[PDB]
Assembly symmetry: D2
Homo-oligomer: 140 residues x 4
Amino acid sequence: PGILGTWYNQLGSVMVVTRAANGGFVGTYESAVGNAEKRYVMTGRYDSAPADGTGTAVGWTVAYRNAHRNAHSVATWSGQYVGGSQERIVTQWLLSYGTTPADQWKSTFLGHDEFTRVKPSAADVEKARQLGVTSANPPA
Amino acid sequence: PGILGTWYNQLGSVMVVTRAANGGFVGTYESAVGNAEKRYVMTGRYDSAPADGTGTAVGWTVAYRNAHRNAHSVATWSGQYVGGSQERIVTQWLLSYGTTPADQWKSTFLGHDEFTRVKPSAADVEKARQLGVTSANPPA
Amino acid sequence: PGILGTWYNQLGSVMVVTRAANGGFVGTYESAVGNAEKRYVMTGRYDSAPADGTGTAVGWTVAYRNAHRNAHSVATWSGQYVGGSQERIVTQWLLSYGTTPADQWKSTFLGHDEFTRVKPSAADVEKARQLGVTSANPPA
Amino acid sequence: PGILGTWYNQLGSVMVVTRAANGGFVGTYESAVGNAEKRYVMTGRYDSAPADGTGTAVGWTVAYRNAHRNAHSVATWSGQYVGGSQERIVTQWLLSYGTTPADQWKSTFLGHDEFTRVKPSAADVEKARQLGVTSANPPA
């Protein structure tokens, strides 16, 4: 299964898939790099037998709580992994918060994100974040 | 954790959560009822310590392939579980297909769905489906 | 064109289409009822020749600013009008805010809404809002 | 108002805003370039008084029918215009089709798109489309 390994976005987030078999996979998701306070558990599913010549449909979930922080939000990513020699994952993501009944309309944010095997340079991360941080960065 | 148990929508789909602990849960998802050919594995995450007076943020994923069928698609649900005496889960869902590069724009469908502990009557399921089937029903 | 007229949701919002011709339409959108401080200009487009036996694809936009308030947000609705004797509009909506570059990830909320020709009772509006206000209600 | 003028994406689509005043704007949208058969009418709204230091919230709609073609779909874009010396519009889009009641779940596609004042080179358009066409390209 091709989704195994480490994946980077353009803003400095890192997803690590540690195990993948029979349509399920598991790992971690860090919005930062190398700090146990913004790493979180990840779980997902994938198409274990994709149609010839197409990408591999994928999806996964991350609850933004660990032993050190709780943002009271959970994100899901939905998209596909594209092999070839240039490996990519293209997704749209949703981030949902727990709310009171009156605040249910402002419970879910929507965005997009793209992952690559090529770790971007720190210079590229700074230019990209300056144009805008488009991946979820929930505080506190 | 409140999400344990069986959940129904208004169109005849059934989600069963068999295990939930430390922010993770697992189970099955059936678009039909009681037939091993449209049951699929489910995995997700939830907020294990929600803020007082708010709903519990949740998310989960289902790959639409089993031993009998493969739709080449994977769905993710994002929303929150609301306790009280009237227990509900309100979500928005995404369904992503594997595609060629030229077809990437038509890879992801978007919708909404609401789950209840009250199993609807067959009469209510028929009236609801006649107004429109708004939950994912991917063929073949 | 069938979209002409007045449309209600279940939470107390009212959309009035005053003119519709050649694929375009115009009107107003009130999150309240009968108060010039939460009425806003609406503009949209529709399919002027839908396929036989299908709904009519629609879309429209509302900027949440008038002479009395400005929420600094703009919403878009996307879906279809369904005729027959029971007329409905089913949509998903997006609400986007202006942000700094660092806050771009929290710029867009996502939701769903359904419109009917039947004005709901005030009792039905209160029960529905108590279960949750799922249409956009941006403050200030 | 800054949104006036011509905007390009990375896949070869062109949006022209011909008029903008008092929170409304109008123009055209071409998925191709310079051919009256894939140009369509556009209408939208914007925040006419954005908060200092933030982007300008925007939204607009395009029905994919003209005198020569009808795709039976309507798209909406939701996001914000960002000024400075590097002018951009970042959006998420929805494309909704008219359907039968049973097919309502597959009525709406979701995607993302980014617009610039810099017209990309034909070489850049080909490389980008080869990685994937991520803007709406509805056939027939």
